[PDB]
């Protein structure tokens, strides 16, 4: 019953987050500012302090600025805040990014370090040198003269846990991690969707070191095929904007991109090129040694009988994925609970593998033929 | 559980700390004058009349307003076809308004210079030479063209396999252009409102016309509706109008005049026929996969920064790369350094590159690069 | 209403004159609410299912 | 993609047209055989039974190829007629040259080489017929064989090709006993396997065709059981099921 | 495997029972959860139960031999007699050589060379006598360092240059001295010490001691280089150099006190003040008396200027110091009398705990420290001194009660005595620093913010600490800006490039430049080495005091 202490820790943390004016100067600004303030674009700057401000209603009247903290921050395209009635610039421009971009930023990673992953050690080495190592020890890259690889693609069959490597990177990253699916750019309006790709990157540059994960990239960029029927996907325009951000004039500053696809052949050649994906990581279906580590990790936090033979299940059946191993472990526990045994027998594991692998039918008469 | 208790105790201590912690003349006289000061909404004049001027102005979406000039204004200063500010309460042009800058178009102009020399681009002397006389020599020395009475092409299309160097050359031209360089954001041209983007393209040319001799880089031309299926569904109708507006402004009824257009496309076939037609873009400078002399030069430029033994043979490494784009050759150099970092050797050796050459080309699923077939030797 | 109570993507009520936060209003959901189909739960059939 | 020509090889080294033909054999009447000590047997399902059809022809899926050999055909009807003729021709051609009945494995290898050739040459489609061979030869004794459209062949103590082959093979593997088949027991195994594989209820005599090859007095005596002989075997299987009742 | 054995831990009855039945498993249950119990005593379990575990762990380990692991419990126990019994077992089996060489660093504040003679009665190979004394701790360091790299003026290069402008000219030479293991700092330049002035001149002369961490004969060579120095600042630094010559000397230390030592405000007396800290560098703890007699008249003199008393307090905090729980040091006993003597002199209030608190450090329950604190209570500057002593007196273990007590007192709006309390929080916890993040932005105390950067304390080099210093790199207060580079230096012990470039850009003032040099000064867990952070509680010290503050040294 140590769970109560853990539950208390979670509740206390929420309370801490919940618990996270000048005598005359502030009161004067409070009087100056309207109870409702409307934020609008700045179109023109005039030295008299009366500067044209664009608004949804398009009233662009030159309006005086009296900002106590600072009025030197005014810039073209800045979103100024104006009084609802007078429309004068109230003060320092509002500085918040679009709401859809805010959702991507991730502050908490549920998984821990690379320890949960087993047998993808070569894959771990590549992700670390591209992502974790340059930040931890920048001097090595400068001495070599190499500029650190900034882009990685993880391509593998279903259930090889490409996402698990990404979750592990989130657990130990100085860089802010923005997690965006490739299928999250379906903006119906013409435009907007390519602009959203620009928005994600501008935020990444604002947060300085940043890691971008784009799971299921197949949806955003595939083939770059012609309009054909004339429906015109506009997705190709969205992919072209991403292609521009990764290496299309200017620079990407310090932003690293991790992308994951079940199928890499479909992805258009331009996106999967050096300069957009300098390093490519391949997740193969687990073999035998990799399977042993995964089977141990999944069964590490469960009751295990001496009778169970982990090696027998791994060697007898070949083709099961890392996810399939976890499913066998969950199914085996349920099989034991049916007999009301918390402890898991070897028999339970044998029954479990059969139930999980019933949808996987492969091969035709290619037996006698060769 | 005791260790978990220690963290819970730490959280409780933080909670106690938070609760225990709990237990310019502009804002002065100027505000009193500022609140009375009235507003003047911007509007655009279209006409003027004799005697009482009765200038009629469209606000921007409201109505044609027959507004008389304000008492404290000069009638000559107010002009037909001039932006003006009209007070709503007094219904008169209190002060004239300066012409709209249209900043988003101004933003696309490069302004800054990318720090890449033509020297860094390698293995494409012919492609560089073709760009030089449509971009630098006609502008820098127009006299030579005039002597033969030959006009410059005034248009260039860079097309090639991805990673060839088309954009790298373009940034190099920007470094030494000595004339306005206008990189165009393809997504910006597409806009929510119908033909709103087409209005921007007119502005793009207008800005180009105001500056004397400027080069406009339409990178990713495919983004700017570079196709004209124009099917009955007309899903791309708004973009198709934007593309046609670019084509007419580019050429026909007086063309660029002093504007040189550089357009770069990974897929040239997709581009619409009217844009491909010359006059709009006279030159067709296709970039090509580098030859062995080019492959050695790209390796040498990329590896000059890296610390390596002086005896390495780039010619062997380039030969081992049968058909490699410049980006892949750069990928070999960076990968070779990464192998040396893995073994912690500060100075890399020829072997490191060979391992990288296998990794960058053969290890990738090229299939042709990796040989299991005895077939040919 | 506390500032803490306010959250992103929450449908609050803005006062007619001063746009003040009058109250927090729930049911901030798109047409997918009809798809829930939780209401009018289907006729009980666990016994009616056969072999 | 890599279909059409038997000649094209898929990037995974797979001849799809040959594979498609081997899969196609499934849409055919069930044919099964048991090696049987002191005998050998071939059993087939007579599909497409109708009141008007005469069935005057002796047999329909069972064809003798020699004095001491026979085959059952499952596949495209026209291709079967072509192959049966060639198999009959090869058998007599060997007798003419060597004056001895062709060894059973050789007749099978020869047709299989012809079937194999069709796959290697562009112009023709791979044969859609698979067949089972029953015969006695002095060199290796009673034998049973299977041929595939791919041209591969094998010798099986028991095997099935048409319709639900996997169901018969699973039933045969458990029921069959090595060295104890004893012909009459093998006939019973066939009737029981046939009942399971055929969706037909009661396994009526018209639906089943049984051919048994035995060596009597030094001479092979291939015989196709008459309907009355087939009926008694069916009644015995039904009676055995009645004995199984209550105990099961 | 001891999973259900830990259940009987609460009854200590468990300690005696655990030794009674522990036989088959050399480690296993003895390690793991029982070792985790030792780790938990460091993490959550209270100090009195922790002391009982240390004896229990020693008892199980003694059956399994392995004297060095038993020694680690004994140093944590802080019981010299128990440690001596283990030393007799470690002397019995000769690894004994590693045990002694590591012992000089491993030994707690209980003894410095006292541990060297703890098992000396047998003497035998004379291991520990030389191994646990400064004789073997740094004798192979110079050859071992030579194999890895060659010491030189590389950090004096332009990338590592700390600039001049007088204030940073002294800092630049001292920063080069930190790189000095490396013995040419005085040789570098012509009269580099002459370029150094006042407090900086003391630092350059001190660099002779820094130049040789070990070697009495080499240090005498340093003494000849600046023998009978003409300027008082050179003379004071040379006496300090005699102190820094060795972790322990037994030779130069006796003359260093004898030289000068006027015992009243005077030139010779101020010149001796350097030697007083240098003799302090030799030892640490609470209750030793080997060289106490030499330093006894210095605090007894109680000169009105804090300079004699403060160096004497620093000296006593690290001179006559051995036993745990604090002690009645004859000078510390009269230090309280000197503290009672001065109603004013706020410098005394900060400096007196440098000795009293250091004695009260390396303590367990510290009830004796509380009794000394009752004598200390009086006027508010003395009350602040009492708080600083109490902060050092806190156990420094898993107990959160002491931390919560400082936290509640710190929350009070007046923080004059609570300035160092935030630093004390770090001293107590050395395991899971979940509570290490401090909501300094929520705190409105300028003083609280000033010590906030120091509150992170010494670190291996983790980036999280660097990020906090960078965020607070340019706070409005100069003191706030000054603290972040010293704190960055503590973590330093990019890797260092990002701080050097950022500090230079943000700085541009002389004040800003010097703090930046201090972070680059350190560009390239021991009970005895728990001395420098305590030695610089307030970076509020003026530039002359900061030059005196350069004396801090101990970590490898
Ligand atoms: N000839 C070359 N010389 C030097 N670097 C080159 C060359 N070709 C390619 N590169 C390298 O490849 C990248 C330049 O790619 P660039 O900006 O030209 O876009 P691109 O990939 O050719 O364009 P697109 O994606 O539209 O096909 C840089 O990393 C650059 O160093």
PDB file of C-alpha atoms in Angstrom, chain A residues 147-280:
ATOM      1  CA  UNK A 147      28.546  20.099 -38.443  1.00  0.00           C
ATOM      2  CA  UNK A 148      26.254  17.750 -36.416  1.00  0.00           C
ATOM      3  CA  UNK A 149      23.681  15.796 -38.508  1.00  0.00           C
ATOM      4  CA  UNK A 150      20.318  17.581 -37.926  1.00  0.00           C
ATOM      5  CA  UNK A 151      17.783  15.161 -39.472  1.00  0.00           C
ATOM      6  CA  UNK A 152      16.856  11.490 -38.882  1.00  0.00           C
ATOM      7  CA  UNK A 153      14.206   9.154 -40.369  1.00  0.00           C
ATOM      8  CA  UNK A 154      13.145   5.971 -38.530  1.00  0.00           C
ATOM      9  CA  UNK A 155      11.680   3.419 -40.989  1.00  0.00           C
ATOM     10  CA  UNK A 156      10.543  -0.062 -39.925  1.00  0.00           C
ATOM     11  CA  UNK A 157       7.806  -2.741 -40.154  1.00  0.00           C
ATOM     12  CA  UNK A 158       4.750  -2.238 -37.846  1.00  0.00           C
ATOM     13  CA  UNK A 159       5.469  -2.637 -34.097  1.00  0.00           C
ATOM     14  CA  UNK A 160       9.279  -2.212 -34.177  1.00  0.00           C
ATOM     15  CA  UNK A 161       8.826   0.642 -31.645  1.00  0.00           C
ATOM     16  CA  UNK A 162      10.225   3.521 -33.749  1.00  0.00           C
ATOM     17  CA  UNK A 163       7.974   5.787 -31.588  1.00  0.00           C
ATOM     18  CA  UNK A 164       9.560   4.291 -28.401  1.00  0.00           C
ATOM     19  CA  UNK A 165      12.959   5.730 -29.454  1.00  0.00           C
ATOM     20  CA  UNK A 166      11.234   9.121 -29.903  1.00  0.00           C
ATOM     21  CA  UNK A 167       9.578   8.868 -26.438  1.00  0.00           C
ATOM     22  CA  UNK A 168      13.015   7.977 -24.984  1.00  0.00           C
ATOM     23  CA  UNK A 169      14.569  11.071 -26.647  1.00  0.00           C
ATOM     24  CA  UNK A 170      11.817  13.184 -25.031  1.00  0.00           C
ATOM     25  CA  UNK A 171      12.739  11.752 -21.587  1.00  0.00           C
ATOM     26  CA  UNK A 172      16.352  12.972 -21.782  1.00  0.00           C
ATOM     27  CA  UNK A 173      16.402  16.083 -23.987  1.00  0.00           C
ATOM     28  CA  UNK A 174      17.535  19.634 -23.093  1.00  0.00           C
ATOM     29  CA  UNK A 175      15.761  20.752 -26.276  1.00  0.00           C
ATOM     30  CA  UNK A 176      12.033  21.541 -26.190  1.00  0.00           C
ATOM     31  CA  UNK A 177      10.268  18.637 -27.939  1.00  0.00           C
ATOM     32  CA  UNK A 178       7.414  19.471 -30.332  1.00  0.00           C
ATOM     33  CA  UNK A 179       5.440  16.284 -31.125  1.00  0.00           C
ATOM     34  CA  UNK A 180       3.389  16.787 -34.333  1.00  0.00           C
ATOM     35  CA  UNK A 181       1.815  13.982 -36.386  1.00  0.00           C
ATOM     36  CA  UNK A 182       2.355  14.236 -40.177  1.00  0.00           C
ATOM     37  CA  UNK A 183      -1.439  13.807 -40.487  1.00  0.00           C
ATOM     38  CA  UNK A 184      -2.106  16.965 -38.379  1.00  0.00           C
ATOM     39  CA  UNK A 185      -1.912  19.268 -41.466  1.00  0.00           C
ATOM     40  CA  UNK A 186      -5.444  18.750 -42.956  1.00  0.00           C
ATOM     41  CA  UNK A 187      -6.394  22.454 -42.881  1.00  0.00           C
ATOM     42  CA  UNK A 188      -9.503  22.680 -45.137  1.00  0.00           C
ATOM     43  CA  UNK A 189      -8.968  26.376 -45.981  1.00  0.00           C
ATOM     44  CA  UNK A 190      -6.790  26.992 -49.059  1.00  0.00           C
ATOM     45  CA  UNK A 191      -3.509  28.159 -47.507  1.00  0.00           C
ATOM     46  CA  UNK A 192      -3.270  28.011 -43.671  1.00  0.00           C
ATOM     47  CA  UNK A 193      -1.939  24.396 -43.726  1.00  0.00           C
ATOM     48  CA  UNK A 194       1.404  25.291 -45.408  1.00  0.00           C
ATOM     49  CA  UNK A 195       1.412  28.358 -43.086  1.00  0.00           C
ATOM     50  CA  UNK A 196       0.968  26.023 -40.045  1.00  0.00           C
ATOM     51  CA  UNK A 197       4.177  24.210 -41.119  1.00  0.00           C
ATOM     52  CA  UNK A 198       5.894  27.647 -41.083  1.00  0.00           C
ATOM     53  CA  UNK A 199       4.384  28.296 -37.611  1.00  0.00           C
ATOM     54  CA  UNK A 200       5.740  25.044 -36.100  1.00  0.00           C
ATOM     55  CA  UNK A 201       9.269  25.879 -37.314  1.00  0.00           C
ATOM     56  CA  UNK A 202       9.199  29.536 -36.178  1.00  0.00           C
ATOM     57  CA  UNK A 203       8.282  28.349 -32.625  1.00  0.00           C
ATOM     58  CA  UNK A 204      11.117  25.794 -32.739  1.00  0.00           C
ATOM     59  CA  UNK A 205      13.608  28.586 -33.599  1.00  0.00           C
ATOM     60  CA  UNK A 206      12.111  30.752 -30.775  1.00  0.00           C
ATOM     61  CA  UNK A 207      12.700  27.907 -28.265  1.00  0.00           C
ATOM     62  CA  UNK A 208      16.326  27.619 -29.512  1.00  0.00           C
ATOM     63  CA  UNK A 209      17.463  23.892 -29.162  1.00  0.00           C
ATOM     64  CA  UNK A 210      14.346  21.922 -30.214  1.00  0.00           C
ATOM     65  CA  UNK A 211      13.540  18.382 -31.453  1.00  0.00           C
ATOM     66  CA  UNK A 212      10.620  17.934 -33.896  1.00  0.00           C
ATOM     67  CA  UNK A 213       8.920  14.529 -34.164  1.00  0.00           C
ATOM     68  CA  UNK A 214       6.609  13.968 -37.200  1.00  0.00           C
ATOM     69  CA  UNK A 215       5.165  10.446 -36.770  1.00  0.00           C
ATOM     70  CA  UNK A 216       3.425   8.931 -39.843  1.00  0.00           C
ATOM     71  CA  UNK A 217       5.162  11.392 -42.281  1.00  0.00           C
ATOM     72  CA  UNK A 218       3.669   9.335 -45.145  1.00  0.00           C
ATOM     73  CA  UNK A 219       0.471  11.448 -45.041  1.00  0.00           C
ATOM     74  CA  UNK A 220       2.208  14.878 -45.306  1.00  0.00           C
ATOM     75  CA  UNK A 221       4.631  13.978 -48.144  1.00  0.00           C
ATOM     76  CA  UNK A 222       4.373  11.087 -50.626  1.00  0.00           C
ATOM     77  CA  UNK A 223       5.361  10.840 -54.367  1.00  0.00           C
ATOM     78  CA  UNK A 224       4.643  14.548 -55.266  1.00  0.00           C
ATOM     79  CA  UNK A 225       2.369  13.086 -58.008  1.00  0.00           C
ATOM     80  CA  UNK A 226       0.599  15.392 -60.545  1.00  0.00           C
ATOM     81  CA  UNK A 227      -2.945  16.775 -59.942  1.00  0.00           C
ATOM     82  CA  UNK A 228      -4.375  14.076 -62.304  1.00  0.00           C
ATOM     83  CA  UNK A 229      -8.167  14.239 -61.626  1.00  0.00           C
ATOM     84  CA  UNK A 230      -7.695  17.949 -60.755  1.00  0.00           C
ATOM     85  CA  UNK A 231      -8.789  17.579 -57.123  1.00  0.00           C
ATOM     86  CA  UNK A 232      -5.365  19.095 -56.260  1.00  0.00           C
ATOM     87  CA  UNK A 233      -4.359  17.796 -52.828  1.00  0.00           C
ATOM     88  CA  UNK A 234      -2.601  21.071 -51.716  1.00  0.00           C
ATOM     89  CA  UNK A 235      -0.759  18.565 -49.452  1.00  0.00           C
ATOM     90  CA  UNK A 236       2.081  18.781 -52.014  1.00  0.00           C
ATOM     91  CA  UNK A 237       2.212  22.562 -51.321  1.00  0.00           C
ATOM     92  CA  UNK A 238       2.326  21.743 -47.573  1.00  0.00           C
ATOM     93  CA  UNK A 239       5.182  19.250 -48.119  1.00  0.00           C
ATOM     94  CA  UNK A 240       7.026  21.828 -50.272  1.00  0.00           C
ATOM     95  CA  UNK A 241       6.817  24.341 -47.373  1.00  0.00           C
ATOM     96  CA  UNK A 242       8.287  21.677 -45.012  1.00  0.00           C
ATOM     97  CA  UNK A 243      10.968  20.982 -47.659  1.00  0.00           C
ATOM     98  CA  UNK A 244      11.651  24.759 -47.744  1.00  0.00           C
ATOM     99  CA  UNK A 245      11.915  24.937 -43.934  1.00  0.00           C
ATOM    100  CA  UNK A 246      14.342  21.973 -43.683  1.00  0.00           C
ATOM    101  CA  UNK A 247      16.727  23.252 -46.446  1.00  0.00           C
ATOM    102  CA  UNK A 248      15.129  25.950 -48.677  1.00  0.00           C
ATOM    103  CA  UNK A 249      17.225  29.175 -48.519  1.00  0.00           C
ATOM    104  CA  UNK A 250      18.175  30.910 -45.207  1.00  0.00           C
ATOM    105  CA  UNK A 251      19.060  28.302 -42.505  1.00  0.00           C
ATOM    106  CA  UNK A 252      17.325  25.993 -39.952  1.00  0.00           C
ATOM    107  CA  UNK A 253      19.297  27.474 -37.009  1.00  0.00           C
ATOM    108  CA  UNK A 254      19.336  24.798 -34.251  1.00  0.00           C
ATOM    109  CA  UNK A 255      16.241  22.599 -34.879  1.00  0.00           C
ATOM    110  CA  UNK A 256      16.500  18.784 -35.276  1.00  0.00           C
ATOM    111  CA  UNK A 257      13.840  16.698 -37.078  1.00  0.00           C
ATOM    112  CA  UNK A 258      12.935  13.061 -36.256  1.00  0.00           C
ATOM    113  CA  UNK A 259      10.423  11.457 -38.665  1.00  0.00           C
ATOM    114  CA  UNK A 260       8.896   7.954 -38.596  1.00  0.00           C
ATOM    115  CA  UNK A 261       7.329   6.007 -41.504  1.00  0.00           C
ATOM    116  CA  UNK A 262       6.046   2.414 -41.748  1.00  0.00           C
ATOM    117  CA  UNK A 263       6.839   2.580 -45.523  1.00  0.00           C
ATOM    118  CA  UNK A 264       9.881   4.633 -46.728  1.00  0.00           C
ATOM    119  CA  UNK A 265       9.623   3.808 -50.486  1.00  0.00           C
ATOM    120  CA  UNK A 266       6.379   5.853 -50.853  1.00  0.00           C
ATOM    121  CA  UNK A 267       8.064   8.968 -49.381  1.00  0.00           C
ATOM    122  CA  UNK A 268       9.111  11.442 -52.145  1.00  0.00           C
ATOM    123  CA  UNK A 269      12.879  11.499 -52.912  1.00  0.00           C
ATOM    124  CA  UNK A 270      13.334  15.241 -52.271  1.00  0.00           C
ATOM    125  CA  UNK A 271      12.151  14.989 -48.626  1.00  0.00           C
ATOM    126  CA  UNK A 272      14.330  11.883 -47.942  1.00  0.00           C
ATOM    127  CA  UNK A 273      17.631  13.444 -49.122  1.00  0.00           C
ATOM    128  CA  UNK A 274      20.900  14.426 -47.366  1.00  0.00           C
ATOM    129  CA  UNK A 275      20.296  17.983 -46.061  1.00  0.00           C
ATOM    130  CA  UNK A 276      16.801  17.102 -44.892  1.00  0.00           C
ATOM    131  CA  UNK A 277      17.516  13.616 -43.446  1.00  0.00           C
ATOM    132  CA  UNK A 278      21.336  13.411 -43.071  1.00  0.00           C
ATOM    133  CA  UNK A 279      21.113  10.182 -40.989  1.00  0.00           C
ATOM    134  CA  UNK A 280      18.654   7.335 -41.717  1.00  0.00           C
TER     135      UNK A 280
END
